[PDB]
Amino acid sequence: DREVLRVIFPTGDSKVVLPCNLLRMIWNAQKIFHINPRLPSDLHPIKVVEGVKELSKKLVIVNGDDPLSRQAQENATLLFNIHLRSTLCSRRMAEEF
Amino acid sequence: NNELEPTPGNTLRQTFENQVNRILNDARDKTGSSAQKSLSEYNNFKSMVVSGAKGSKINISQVIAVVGQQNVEGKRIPFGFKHRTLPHFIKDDYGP
Amino acid sequence: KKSAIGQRIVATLPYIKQEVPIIIVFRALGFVSDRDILEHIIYDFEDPEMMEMVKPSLDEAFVIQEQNVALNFIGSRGAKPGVTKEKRIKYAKEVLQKEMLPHVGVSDFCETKKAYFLGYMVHRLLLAALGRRELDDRDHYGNKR
Amino acid sequence: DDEEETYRLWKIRKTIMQLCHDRGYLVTQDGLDQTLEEFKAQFGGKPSEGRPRRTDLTVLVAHNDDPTDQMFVFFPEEPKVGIKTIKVYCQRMQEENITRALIVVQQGMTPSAKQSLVDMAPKYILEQFLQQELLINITEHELVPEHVVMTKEEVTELLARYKLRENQLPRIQAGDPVARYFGIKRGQVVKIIRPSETAGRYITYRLVQ
Amino acid sequence: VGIRFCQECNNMLYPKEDKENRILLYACRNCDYQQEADNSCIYVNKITHEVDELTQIIADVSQDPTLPRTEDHPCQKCGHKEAVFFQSHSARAEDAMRLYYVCTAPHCGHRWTE
Amino acid sequence: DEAHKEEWNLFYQKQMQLRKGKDPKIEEFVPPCPLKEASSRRIPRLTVKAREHCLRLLEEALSSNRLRAKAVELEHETFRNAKVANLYKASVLKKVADIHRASK
Amino acid sequence: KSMESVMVKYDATVRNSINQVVQLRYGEDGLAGESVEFQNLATLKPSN
Amino acid sequence: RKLRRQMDIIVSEVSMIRDIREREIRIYTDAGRICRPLLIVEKQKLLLKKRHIDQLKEREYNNYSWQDLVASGVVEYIDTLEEETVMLAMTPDDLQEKEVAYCSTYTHCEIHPSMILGVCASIIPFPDHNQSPRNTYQSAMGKQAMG
Amino acid sequence: KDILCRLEHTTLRKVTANTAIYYDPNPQSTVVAEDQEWVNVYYRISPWLLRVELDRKHMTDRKLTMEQIAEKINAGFGDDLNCIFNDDNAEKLVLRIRIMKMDDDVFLRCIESNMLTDMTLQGIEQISKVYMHLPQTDNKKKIIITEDGEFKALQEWILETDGVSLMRVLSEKDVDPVRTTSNDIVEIFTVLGIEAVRKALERELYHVISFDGSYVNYRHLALLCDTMTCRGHLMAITRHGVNRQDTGPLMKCSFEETVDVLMEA
DNA sequence: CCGTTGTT
DNA sequence: CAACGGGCGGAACTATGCC
RNA sequence: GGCAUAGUUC
Numbered sequence A: 001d002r003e004v005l006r007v008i009f010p011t012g013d014s015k016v017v018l019p020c021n022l023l024r025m026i027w028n029a030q031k032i033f034h035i036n037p038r039l040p041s042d043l044h045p046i047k048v049v050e051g052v053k054e055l056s057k058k059l060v061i062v063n064g065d066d067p068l069s070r071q072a073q074e075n076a077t078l079l080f081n082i083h084l085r086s087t088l089c090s091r092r093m094a095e096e097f
Numbered sequence B: 001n002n003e004l005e006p007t008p009g010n011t012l013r014q015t016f017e018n019q020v021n022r023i024l025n026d027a028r029d030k031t032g033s034s035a036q037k038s039l040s041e042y043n044n045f046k047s048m049v050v051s052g053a054k055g056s057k058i059n060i061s062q063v064i065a066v067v068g069q070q071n072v073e074g075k076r077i078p079f080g081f082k083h084r085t086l087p088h089f090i091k092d093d094y095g096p
Numbered sequence C: 001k002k003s004a005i006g007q008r009i010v011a012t013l014p015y016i017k018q019e020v021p022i023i024i025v026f027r028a029l030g031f032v033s034d035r036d037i038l039e040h041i042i043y044d045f046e047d048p049e050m051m052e053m054v055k056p057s058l059d060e061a062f063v064i065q066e067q068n069v070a071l072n073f074i075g076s077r078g079a080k081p082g083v084t085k086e087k088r089i090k091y092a093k094e095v096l097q098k099e100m101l102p103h104v105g106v107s108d109f110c111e112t113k114k115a116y117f118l119g120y121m122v123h124r125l126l127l128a129a130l131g132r133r134e135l136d137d138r139d140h141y142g143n144k145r
Numbered sequence D: 001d002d003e004e005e006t007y008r009l010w011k012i013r014k015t016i017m018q019l020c021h022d023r024g025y026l027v028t029q030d031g032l033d034q035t036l037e038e039f040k041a042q043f044g045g046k047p048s049e050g051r052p053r054r055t056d057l058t059v060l061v062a063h064n065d066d067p068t069d070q071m072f073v074f075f076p077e078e079p080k081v082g083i084k085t086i087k088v089y090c091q092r093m094q095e096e097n098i099t100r101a102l103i104v105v106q107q108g109m110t111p112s113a114k115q116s117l118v119d120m121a122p123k124y125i126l127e128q129f130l131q132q133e134l135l136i137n138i139t140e141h142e143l144v145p146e147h148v149v150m151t152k153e154e155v156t157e158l159l160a161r162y163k164l165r166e167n168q169l170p171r172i173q174a175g176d177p178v179a180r181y182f183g184i185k186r187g188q189v190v191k192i193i194r195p196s197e198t199a200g201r202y203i204t205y206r207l208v209q
Numbered sequence E: 001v002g003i004r005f006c007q008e009c010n011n012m013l014y015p016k017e018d019k020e021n022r023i024l025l026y027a028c029r030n031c032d033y034q035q036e037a038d039n040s041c042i043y044v045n046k047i048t049h050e051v052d053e054l055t056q057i058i059a060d061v062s063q064d065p066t067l068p069r070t071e072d073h074p075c076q077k078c079g080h081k082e083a084v085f086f087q088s089h090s091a092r093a094e095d096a097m098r099l100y101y102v103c104t105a106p107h108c109g110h111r112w113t114e
Numbered sequence F: 001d002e003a004h005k006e007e008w009n010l011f012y013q014k015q016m017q018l019r020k021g022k023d024p025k026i027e028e029f030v031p032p033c034p035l036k037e038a039s040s041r042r043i044p045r046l047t048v049k050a051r052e053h054c055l056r057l058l059e060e061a062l063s064s065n066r067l068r069a070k071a072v073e074l075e076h077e078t079f080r081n082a083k084v085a086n087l088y089k090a091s092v093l094k095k096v097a098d099i100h101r102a103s104k
Numbered sequence G: 001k002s003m004e005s006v007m008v009k010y011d012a013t014v015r016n017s018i019n020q021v022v023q024l025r026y027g028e029d030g031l032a033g034e035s036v037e038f039q040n041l042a043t044l045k046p047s048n
Numbered sequence H: 001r002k003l004r005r006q007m008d009i010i011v012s013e014v015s016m017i018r019d020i021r022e023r024e025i026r027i028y029t030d031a032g033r034i035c036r037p038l039l040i041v042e043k044q045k046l047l048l049k050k051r052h053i054d055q056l057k058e059r060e061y062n063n064y065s066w067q068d069l070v071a072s073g074v075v076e077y078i079d080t081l082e083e084e085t086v087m088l089a090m091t092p093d094d095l096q097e098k099e100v101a102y103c104s105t106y107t108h109c110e111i112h113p114s115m116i117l118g119v120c121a122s123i124i125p126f127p128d129h130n131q132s133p134r135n136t137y138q139s140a141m142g143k144q145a146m147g
Numbered sequence I: 001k002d003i004l005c006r007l008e009h010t011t012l013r014k015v016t017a018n019t020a021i022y023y024d025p026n027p028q029s030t031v032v033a034e035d036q037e038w039v040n041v042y043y044r045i046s047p048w049l050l051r052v053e054l055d056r057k058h059m060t061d062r063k064l065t066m067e068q069i070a071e072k073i074n075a076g077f078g079d080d081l082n083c084i085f086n087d088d089n090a091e092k093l094v095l096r097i098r099i100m101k102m103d104d105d106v107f108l109r110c111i112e113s114n115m116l117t118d119m120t121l122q123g124i125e126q127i128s129k130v131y132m133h134l135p136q137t138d139n140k141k142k143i144i145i146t147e148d149g150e151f152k153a154l155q156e157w158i159l160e161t162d163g164v165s166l167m168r169v170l171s172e173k174d175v176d177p178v179r180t181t182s183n184d185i186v187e188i189f190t191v192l193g194i195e196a197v198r199k200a201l202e203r204e205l206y207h208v209i210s211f212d213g214s215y216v217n218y219r220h221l222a223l224l225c226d227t228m229t230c231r232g233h234l235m236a237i238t239r240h241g242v243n244r245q246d247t248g249p250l251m252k253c254s255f256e257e258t259v260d261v262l263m264e265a
Numbered sequence J: 001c002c003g004t005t006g007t008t
Numbered sequence K: 001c002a003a004c005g006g007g008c009g010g011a012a013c014t015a016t017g018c019c
Numbered sequence L: 001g002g003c004a005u006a007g008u009u010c
């Protein structure tokens, strides 16, 4: 995904416009569930990976199951899925959030 | 004294005008910065500019320090009369 | 031929169908010699650039040489072109005596001054073309009433 | 100059090699990538009174799906190609049993020759390319997104999937530069693949009409 | 260069070729008046044309009340101190802002440019 | 400019036709002379007369700079590089004059 | 006047009054303008 | 100019222009030229004197007025294209005086520089502390006030 | 600077100093005393002359050569002219032209006039003036990816001309055929197709909108560009483009042509 | 100012 | 290359002359 | 009743 991003965005511009504000959602989750950042957590990184993979299937823009429709949906949600994976990376979840 | 050398891509008139306008813009901006940094913590212009309500630092500069250069069609004021701006100036006067 | 000629001077007289070369009008006024026409136009003959500028205008005088034929050429292009020739020539003389530069004069003997004023117009045009005087601006308030 | 003429011939040859590679014909890597010195050595570094005389540079190549379907790339030596030159080329194609051919022109072709090229369209297919139009590859320009020619099976599947009649697709003229580069006739559909700022990729379709 | 006129009809003299003596003749189209010229050059065209205005500057500009005056540039001829000055004051002068000077002493009219 | 240009070209061609000596009789090339390619017709209206004419200039330039072999190499390199006679002359002149400035 | 009749169809495609496709997905992604925000990708710029 | 100032042969309305560089003298008796009065500066001193000022300030019961000021050759009418051959001074007692020499050949002087404003813009107080669009807007809104 | 010279149009008037037409039948006894030595060394024909003088500053600024000028003249006029030229050694650079109804003086004035306004010594036609300045923006600079994966911005000279001829500039040697671009939409169309014209139109609209610092969502830009370039040819938003659409007459009648459209239908 | 149609 | 024809902001409020 | 012209507000 990093290589795909570097092809899509030469001249290195990170700023982009996408529908869900993942960082603010994470901040809201932390404050809602009274997460203490100084303690070890109970989140399994495999659970993180599986949850992201299952979530990406429910964000459907092009509905279908033909190869043409699947290609259309992948093209329609490529950038947002790249952003989603980058944010919900397991190491970032374990260290930062 | 013809000692001015033209800048590449520009005419002699163009380079002279560029230097003059640059000097005057530097003067106006420096006086504006002085006027800004000499304000007070109770000043109402600062109150209405810092909070973003209405006004700007250029307006404060024009009120306090210097109104600045006046331009017509992007150039300095032209020679309406024969080689002079007004009947109160000598001919061929390029001063500020 | 156009590339060698360069610039030519023409005059748009009122109540005439299209343009006329200036030497034709000067001849129609009654001046035949190029020396006399250049006396009326170029005041100081020690100006070779002005002389060269006016030379292509005089090269249109290779054909026309007399007042009668010049008047015929001028009057050929009236508001209603005539079926005869004497009426056309009379119309040409009438236009050059009544509608060209009325402020100089309208009497019978006004040609000697109309020629000088037309020469002044041509001279000022040459000065403008040579870059010796600034072109006028319509927004100057000395040029308004 | 001789150096400039060699350079122009080499650039035209390289662009035509790239064109044939894109059109699916079988051009090898060494033919695709020739240095200027290699071309000078192989076919004359002196054009004027030299071995390369806008002839012997003609290219015959066979399509990757059918060695029987082959294409010519002819180099007329005349600044204005004429009716008799077109007839000579068509005779050579007929005798070699070749259907399609390209023709790179020095300056231009007379309208009579162009119409005599159009007339034999079902019998033979010939295209005119100017010398200036091939010094560069328009496909490599960054403003030009990738184009893919779609088969009739892929068109039919696309139309059925979206329930579209061919009137309802965007169009592209048969005189388009890229359309001429790919050699596309009316009724074929091209596919455009380009990156997007809001999605990351976007596939469009154009109908040649 | 200049224009020369016939003495009979007073018309412009065009150049005509004498294909016998290999000589240049100026002849008019009205009469048969011939001449031999000394310039030997039909046409001259200079495209630089950076004419020095000292030929075209009149000495009468010294009476202009609207012109600046200086006393640090004495006249070369009569040694008069005060001297009016101005720029090219003409179009087709590129962009040169060189100054020009005219002596203000009556009947001197010295017009130089340092 | 096209219509005026075409008319100018046609005019130029017609004036040139009208300014010909009426029969363009195609005289043959000139035979030799130590020079290389002396049978060449490669430059229109250049001659073996001109080749010999230039040889003098090379020999005298070399002789004062200080041989007929080096003269023929200078000539032949110039003869290959050349395509028009006035240019062939121009090259010969330029070498002799500027090398004279180094012989000085 | 140029774009007065361009609409989003229930097919999710963008078509004019003659049902000619303009975009297969509106805005090339299919989302509405008033619901998107500025964000940073955070994996493009960092070195290896 | 002497004849026009004496008001003997040439009316005060006539304008005379000398184009020094181009050697032309132009005299206009036309109707429609627009002109404004200016004071006359002879060497460096105004021709207007305290005697004129006193005779003016005794204007009642003295039949001395603007016409008698004009007839004395003190003021003059200058139209637009005669203003191109004149050197003006904005204020007498400030620009005629000895300074670092800018111009020592003044030919006229302004009566008061605030007479460049029209009827509706002569009611704005401190117009030189304002912004030009604001002065224009007030010139517009002065014709709508109710009195 | 070499490419700057290659890409800027220049006729003979840009470099000539002065010209004149003489009458000199004698090859040896030349009216002008300056050319004597080399004209004698050089030496049917016509007795008239066309002597021109080339300005040294402009001659040496463009890195031009008198041999190059002579060969260009030969290419332009063929061998029906004669040309003899001095060299830069002398302070006066001289070119002398002679011909190898139809009178000589009027023909020489047409030769001079054509040779001064039609010669095209160098450059590309219709390209008037070409600038050359370092970029100062991150979109006009070349940005690469190093071997360690970062983005590094490089400053390289970029040119900015006046007048457009895109194909020749692209075909020029030592010119990048990928990033070179113009701002004439019709030229981009006729050179690169319809997709390129769409992308370029979007970039031009983005530039004009964002010059003011303002922001407009990309969807609206994309929609306008797709609407303009949907049918394969450029569709100006005028009566022409609006009525070119195969829509109903009632939509066209309400826009810049009512009665004419209704009566045609 | 610039899209049609004529004339050449 | 020349001539011809259509196209040119949005609302709102007073008054006066004339058919 | 309608046509035209002028002025003014945003």
Ligand SMILES: [Zn+2]
Residues within 6 Å of the ligand: E006, E007, E008, E009, E010, E011, E028, E029, E030, E031, E032, E033
């Ligand atoms: Zn005579």
Ligand SMILES: [Zn+2]
Residues within 6 Å of the ligand: E075, E076, E077, E078, E079, E080, E103, E104, E105, E108, E109, E110
């Ligand atoms: Zn003196």
